[PDB]
Write a protein that binds this ligand. Structure first.
Ligand code: MG
Ligand code: MG
Ligand code: MG
Ligand code: MG
Ligand code: MG
Ligand code: MG
Ligand code: MG
Ligand code: MG
Ligand code: MG
Lengths: 252, 145, 111, 62, 70, 90
RNA sequence: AUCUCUCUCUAUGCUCUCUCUC
RNA sequence: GCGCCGUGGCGCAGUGGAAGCGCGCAGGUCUCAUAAACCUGAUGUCCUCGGAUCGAAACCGAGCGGCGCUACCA
RNA sequence: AUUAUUGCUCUUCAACGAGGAAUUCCUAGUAAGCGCAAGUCAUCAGCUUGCGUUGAUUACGUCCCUGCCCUUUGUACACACC
RNA sequence: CGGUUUCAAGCCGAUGGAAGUUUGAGGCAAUAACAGGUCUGUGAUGCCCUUAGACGUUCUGGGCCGCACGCGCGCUACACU
């Protein structure tokens, strides 16, 4: 069986923003599964589901669908969630959505590994997601940091390096657009442009011809932000290297 | 009642009469998975063979399985009369047959073809994709193909 | 049920049937498509002959049989006048189709 | 927190849907208080009525 | 249940050592605490009850009520 | 250069009673919308309501079954073409 | 002098008509 | 060839598990009836094909169509 | 008896994981489960009509929705609010 | 009996009772109608029609039981009782 909570500790906190997938409607409201915190059952009492009277229940809330929510009453003993949908402020909603997305992404990461090798899920959770969270706040932030520069994976060890490699691969060449508008109208201008390209493309990406004045090259990114540094270099080359030819070039 | 624990002798998931026979279903009910084989008649076959029904699917030794197969494919010799088998009387030989696995369907297909050739009502209905055995299509059969 | 069920529809009873015999043409009487359904019993209806006309509802159908837009209709033309003419019999959609198939009316308009 | 009061007299039955009883609750801990309480369901005289609510009271139900 | 309809020797041993300490012994209980799932559990229970091991409370079939000796 | 024929969708929208609604989808955004609505209101017995869609599109409401009449009116009062119209429903 | 104090949308609908003998 | 829309029908939007909105058709429910008001839809997995990874329409490619760049590339 | 009348033996094993918005029925031998006989009938009950076995849960109330009853009230309505 | 109620009309609780909801359920059901339902129960009929190649009548054979669909009753199930 697959279980275990999204965050570090077992039980939710007061005034925690959650996203709730609707299961079934009863009397109090709905016995929803909180997708920001484990799968513990809770309810939205019929007073705090919407800001205004909307009469219809199965169009603004909907069975099977997700709702932007906040946790009101929590009892750290066994398992009760008194929940609200109304108390979520304007804006804020977007943030909540983002958080939910992040959580989902995190969840997606932690299952492939399990599939590849069974072994207790709690242990896996401990060795992948929690220490980072403790250090900062959320696991997605940690993941982002890792992607930017690999150091968070060095902190707590994965069960195998293969998994890490796979993750890296998943994260990974990324195409970045680079458009060159050369102000040429001469017969031997195209050739010149080509020559210029050949001195800049070498030593490291994919140059596409659209027109005689317009040239569109796609630059590869290995670690996402590595593509910006190559683009910059290319730009520099246009201003510094291409001066001997005397061909006027413009960048979008 | 069996106190016998049994060591590594029974191999689950068996390939018997081409169609895959699954694991730990109760011999009779393990045989039922094969087309043409059905509950009561499977039980009868087992009885004829003289194997105890209260056993595992993997438990069965090869000889027993062979015997069972023989009973199934050649039914008439082992005291199984008319109110017993699949194609009683039959249209092609006069002898009755207990058709199995990949035979019954073929027979059905053949019958359908013959009907089509000879343009009979049932055949026509089958060709159409309609209900045959006394049904009012005012409500019946809205699932389609 | 006729139009909208009602408390006040059970004091009427309509008798014609969907399986009724189709009515043919007469002298001073021909077929029209309805151009636009006008007010106060008046109706603009283009004839199959080739004249524009002004059609008018005359009794009978005034409450019994409701009509819509673009319908094939029996119009008995005025023998003394010409511009004002009167609707006699409404044709069903099936009926219209049958007529079209026959070729009794000229094939110019669709149901 | 736990409180309990005995009922003594019923102040009729009120509710849009109805059914819900208006009761006069007397506390067995100090009989000086006789409060108007909302009670859901079949209730007579001389019954111990547990109250999670301590002080809040309402009369009519609309 | 993922099969688990085997009167395995190891399984039998486990049953022997796990039926005490716990007061209640049933097929359902066995299924819950991960050993045998279904029909052969009953058989096992029956063959544990020859002389001693687990004492009966039930005088009824379908549901088994059994307590280990204290 | 501008496209001469754009898909103007005059749809069947169900209004109070057996009556309907002339709803216009894919409206050319060149002339003043409010003014056109006002004009429409004046000409017929209709009330004008505009439902806004992001980037492209504005749903223009006119209470009633006219269609052809509406088209004719549009033709009469400059702002919209003859070829652009499409009747949607039945 | 004993009241106690409740609450909101909901548009329209076309098919007749009837007396007696004193 | 690039970019977005790739549907469960049109018209609008979102990218790593959650069948996204407005309209339309198809059908229901509520009312004596229609409309508003409500649900359910349809090629089951959101271009065609398969894979890395359990998986996904989303990640990757070969392969198509509409327009945001091109101007006919001897 | 084909457009299986039905019955019985056989084999064939789909949809269907307790059911959206909606709405019916019911306050004690009642609800429901379960049969049976009769009616139809030459043959056929998933139907009705009557029995009888098994036998709960919750109300004993209010007018909120849906009606009804009278009293008062207002009606530009008597085809009487459709 | 017990209390309550201008202590009248009655009601709720207790005792006794086979039983205290009019003891349960029926069956008959007023005045007034509806333009409800039926001439497809009839030899209950007015009126109009067809009346001898008959809408009468019977024999032979279908058909009401057809099926892209949409509702209404009911049954069987979705299993451990
Ligand atoms: Mg009538
Ligand atoms: Mg019959
Ligand atoms: Mg009105
Ligand atoms: Mg007395
Ligand atoms: Mg009586
Ligand atoms: Mg007659
Ligand atoms: Mg004749
Ligand atoms: Mg019939
Ligand atoms: Mg009935």
């Amino acid at each position: 069986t697959s279980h275990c909570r999204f965050y570090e500790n077992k039980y939710p906190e007061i005034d925690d923003i959650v996203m709730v997938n609707v299961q079934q409607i009863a009397e109090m409201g709905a016995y929803v599964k909180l997708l920001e915190y484990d799968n513990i059952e809770g309810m939205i009492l019929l007073s705090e589901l919407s800001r205004r009277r909307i009469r219809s229940i199965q169009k603004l809330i909907r069975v099977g669908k997700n709702d932007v929510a906040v946790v009101l009453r929590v009892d750290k003993e066994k398992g009760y969630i008194d929940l609200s949908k109304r108390r979520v402020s304007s804006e804020d909603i977007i943030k909540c959505e983002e958080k939910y997305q992040k959580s989902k992404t995190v969840h997606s990461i932690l299952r492939y590994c399990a599939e590849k090798f069974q072994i207790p899920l709690e242990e896996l959770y401990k060795t992948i997601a929690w220490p980072l969270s403790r250090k900062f706040g959320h696991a997605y932030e940690a993941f982002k940091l890792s992607i930017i520069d690999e150091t968070v994976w060095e902190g707590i060890e994965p069960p195998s390096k293969d998994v890490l490699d796979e993750l890296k691969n998943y994260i990974s060449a990324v195409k970045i657009r680079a458009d060159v508008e050369v102000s040429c109208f001469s017969y031997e201008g195209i050739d010149a442009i080509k020559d210029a390209l050949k001195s800049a493309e070498d030593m490291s990406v994919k140059v596409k011809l659209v027109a005689a004045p317009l040239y569109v090259l796609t630059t590869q990114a290995l670690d996402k932000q590595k593509g910006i540094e190559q683009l910059e270099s290319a730009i520099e080359k246009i201003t510094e290297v291409i001066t001997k030819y005397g061909g006027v070039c413009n960048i979008t | 009642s069996l106190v016998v624990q049994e060591q590594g002798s029974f191999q689950h998931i068996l390939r018997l009469l081409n169609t895959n026979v699954d694991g730990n279903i109760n011999v009779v009910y393990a045989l039922t998975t094969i087309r043409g084989v059905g509950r009561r008649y499977a039980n009868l076959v087992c009885k004829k063979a003289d194997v105890d029904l209260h056993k595992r699917a993997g438990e069965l030794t090869q000889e027993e399985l062979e015997r069972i197969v023989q009973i199934m494919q050649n039914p008439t010799h082992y005291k199984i009369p008319a109110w017993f088998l699949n194609r009683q009387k039959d249209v092609n030989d006069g002898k009755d047959y207990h058709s199995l696995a990949n035979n019954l369907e073929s027979k059905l297909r053949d019958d359908l073809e013959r009907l089509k050739k000879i343009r009979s009502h049932r055949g026509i209905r089958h060709f159409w994709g309609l209900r045959v055995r006394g049904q009012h299509t005012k409500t019946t059969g809205r699932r389609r193909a | 049920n006729t139009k909208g069920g009602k408390k006040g529809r059970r004091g009427k009873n309509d008798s014609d049937g969907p399986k009724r015999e189709l009515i043919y043409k007469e002298e001073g009487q021909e077929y029209a498509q309805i151009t636009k359904m006008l007010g106060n019993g008046r109706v603009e209806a283009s004839c199959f002959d080739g004249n524009k006309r002004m059609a008018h509802i005359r009794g009978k159908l005034r409450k019994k049989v409701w009509m819509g837009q673009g319908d094939i209709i029996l119009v008995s033309l005025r023998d003394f006048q010409d511009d004002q003419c009167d609707v006699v019999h409404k044709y069903n959609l099936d009926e219209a189709r049958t007529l079209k198939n026959q070729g009794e009316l000229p094939e110019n308009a669709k149901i | 927190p736990v409180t309990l009061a005995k009922v003594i007299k019923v102040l009729g039955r009120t509710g849009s849907r109805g059914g819900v009883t208006q009761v006069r609750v007397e506390f067995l801990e100090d009989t000086t208080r006789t409060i108007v309480r909302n009670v859901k369901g079949p209730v007579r005289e001389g019954d111990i009525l547990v109250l999670m609510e301590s002080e809040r009271e309402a009369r009519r139900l609309r | 249940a993922k099969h688990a309809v085997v009167l395995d020797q190891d399984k039998f041993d486990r049953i022997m050592k796990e039926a005490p300490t716990y007061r209640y012994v049933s097929v359902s209980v066995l299924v819950d605490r991960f050993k045998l799932g279904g029909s052969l559990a009953r058989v096992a229970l029956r063959h544990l009850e020859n002389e001693g091991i687990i004492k009966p409370v039930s005088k009824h079939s379908k549901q088994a009520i059994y307590t280990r000796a204290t | 250069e501008t496209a001469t024929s754009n898909y103007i969708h005059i749809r069947i929208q169900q209004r109070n009673g057996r009556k309907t609604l002339t709803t216009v989808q894919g409206v050319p955004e060149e002339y003043d919308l409010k003014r056109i609505l006002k004009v429409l209101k004046k000409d017929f017995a209709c009330n004008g309501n505009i439902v806004k869609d992001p980037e492209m599109g504005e749903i223009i409401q006119l209470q009633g079954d006219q269609r052809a009449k509406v088209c004719e009116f549009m033709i009469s009062q400059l702002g919209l073409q003859k070829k652009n119209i499409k009747i949607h429903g039945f």
